[PDB]
Ligand binder design. Structure first.
Ligand SMILES: Cc1cc2nc3c(=O)[nH]c(=O)nc-3n(C[C@H](O)[C@H](O)[C@H](O)COP(=O)(O)OP(=O)(O)OC[C@H]3O[C@@H](n4cnc5c(N)ncnc54)[C@H](O)[C@@H]3O)c2cc1C
Ligand SMILES: COc1ccc(CNc2nc3cc(C(F)(F)F)ccc3nc2C(=O)O)cc1F
Length: 454
């Protein structure tokens, strides 16, 4: 329970670009206020940045030669209310913790990323998105208030629509550069079960994948995402396994599950690598029977699924996934469909092979100037680090930029300031807010300096 300050070598989830910071770790809020006051009174040096669970791949949660404040000990859930749907929680609370605590109230975390190991602070600061972006927006859309420790040492109560709305919306997606989010109130989504009813589809090509997302069917599902093929030559290029669904109601559950509709079942002992150590391939896998088999297994209607089944389907693959990788995620505006296809073609012909590829059509954006999601074609790819990759991804940056798209700060450790600023045309507007709230650069990070956000 005691406060500690420790020189620590930090990296994001990508394990790249390490830098040494003094890491403060304390469950005492007043100690965090005092540390920020100390940096502020210092009138120099390299400032401070908050750090959550370190799930961002890049360098936004580290500060070489400065202070890093580990927020994970501030993890109190203050209250949950089923009538108002509000949760009041410290910024260090993580989404898995929150999901579990809130389920007995018939409340659902309104935006969940592909991993549950992210803090509320990290969720706000990266304005995270999920499988339901097109129906629910991003994390920032659901924050009703937050308490922000600013450079002047004061704790400001921010609301999306109040007098401090400008600062609220600069903090959403602000990558911790407006101050330290101490605490927040989130509006949860009501639910009668912890289950999904899901429809699966399998497409044969990129053209089919795009048509499926463009035919109006997306409006029938609150949740929608896809795995796609980024390695095969066209026309197989861009074929996808698509998973779409909505939260189930109690009466849609089979009789055996209806007695505990809000139950989160425990992740089981055995994963697929444990049961099939020699892999899943047989003599049929890559020919026409394999094709039919995968088509059939991935095509279904009204299937009842728990959270892991529906939302974390890679979990069953255990140690096989991510077997020195560069995570690259971008969105291209909806209208730019040919441009989007062109970029997918570029990736396939590049000689860089990504096996893990998520595809999603984002919905409307929010008013946060630095928010990543815009309506359009969102893709994540995972490239093994090898010769030529750095220069190739710089070419990808140019294409993404030229086609009106952007990269996501939570995934980036290598784009340039020039590129990033052009991708985010409201960056100057955001920088102006940051300069008002932090004239002395009390808040600073490796990303802030790299991307000239400092
Ligand atoms: C396997 C995996 C799957 C993922 N899937 C998704 C996805 O589906 N959608 C998506 O949007 N993202 C996804 N991400 C990225 C992840 O959601 C974000 O990186 C998120 O910000 C990580 O939260 P964290 O608590 O680990 O924050 P960190 O990585 O520690 O910090 C990220 C940023 O938040 C800031 N920050 C943290 N706490 C505070 C605070 N209290 N006050 C102010 N600023 C703070 C930091 O300064 C930093 O700028 C995924 C990441 C992984 C590893
Ligand atoms: C245990 O192994 C894994 C478990 C889950 C995943 C899914 N990961 C993601 N899933 C993502 C899903 C989305 C979206 F919401 F768009 F579907 C957007 C971004 C995503 N980013 C990521 C990521 O790894 O950074 C990947 C894994 F390698």
């Amino acid at each position: 329970v005691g406060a500690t300050t420790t020189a620590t070598r930090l990296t994001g989830w990508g394990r790249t670009a390490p830098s040494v910071a003094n890491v403060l770790r304390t469950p005492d809020a007043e100690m965090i206020v005092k540390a920020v006051a100390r940096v502020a009174e210092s009138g120099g040096g390299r400032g401070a940045i908050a750090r959550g669970l370190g799930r961002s791949y890049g360098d936004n949660a580290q500060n070489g030669g400065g202070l890093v404040i580990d927020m994970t000990p501030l993890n109190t859930i203050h209250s949950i209310d089923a009538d108002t749907k509000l949760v009041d929680i410290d910024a260090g609370v993580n989404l898995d913790q929150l999901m579990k605590a809130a389920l007995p109230f018939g409340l659902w975390v309104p935006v969940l990323p592909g991993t549950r190991q992210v803090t509320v602070g990290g969720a706000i600061a990266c304005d995270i998105h999920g499988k339901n972006h097109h129906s629910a927006g991003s994390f920032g859309n659901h924050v009703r208030s937050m308490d922000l420790l600013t450079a002047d040492g004061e704790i400001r109560h921010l609301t999306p629509t109040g007098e401090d709305a400008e600062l609220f919306w600069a903090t959403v997606g602000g990558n911790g550069l407006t101050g330290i989010i101490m605490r927040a109130t989130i509006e949860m989504t009501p639910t009668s079960t912890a289950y999904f009813i899901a429809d699966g589809d399998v497409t044969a090509s990129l053209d089919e994948t795009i048509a499926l997302h463009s035919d109006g069917s997306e409006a029938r599902y609150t949740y929608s995402s896809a795995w796609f093929d980024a390695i095969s030559a066209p026309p197989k290029l861009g074929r996808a396994a698509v998973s779409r669904g909505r939260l189930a109601t109690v009466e849609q559950l089979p009789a055996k599950l209806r007695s505990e509709p809000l139950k989160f079942d425990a992740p089981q002992l055995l994963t697929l690598p444990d049961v099939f150590p020699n892999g899943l391939a047989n003599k049929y896998t890559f020919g026409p029977i394999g094709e039919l088999w995968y088509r059939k297994s991935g095509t279904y209607r009204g299937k009842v699924q728990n959270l892991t089944q529906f939302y974390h389907p890679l979990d069953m693959f255990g140690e096989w996934n991510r077997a020195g990788f560069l995570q690259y995620q971008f969105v291209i505006p909806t209208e730019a469909v040919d441009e989007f296809k062109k970029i997918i073609g570029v990736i396939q012909a590049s000689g860089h092979y990504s096996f893990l590829n998520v595809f999603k059509l984002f919905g409307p954006r929010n008013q946060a100037p630095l928010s990543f999601p815009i309506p359009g074609w969102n893709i994540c790819v995972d490239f093994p680090i090898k010769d030529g990759l750095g220069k190739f991804v710089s070419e990808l940056d140019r294409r993404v930029l030229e086609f009106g798209g952007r990269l996501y700060t939570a995934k980036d450790s290598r784009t340039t300031a020039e590129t990033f600023h052009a991708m985010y045309p409201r960056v100057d507007e955001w920088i102006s807010v940051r300069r008002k709230v932090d004239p002395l650069r009390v808040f600073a990070s490796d990303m802030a300096r790299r991307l000239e956000l400092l």
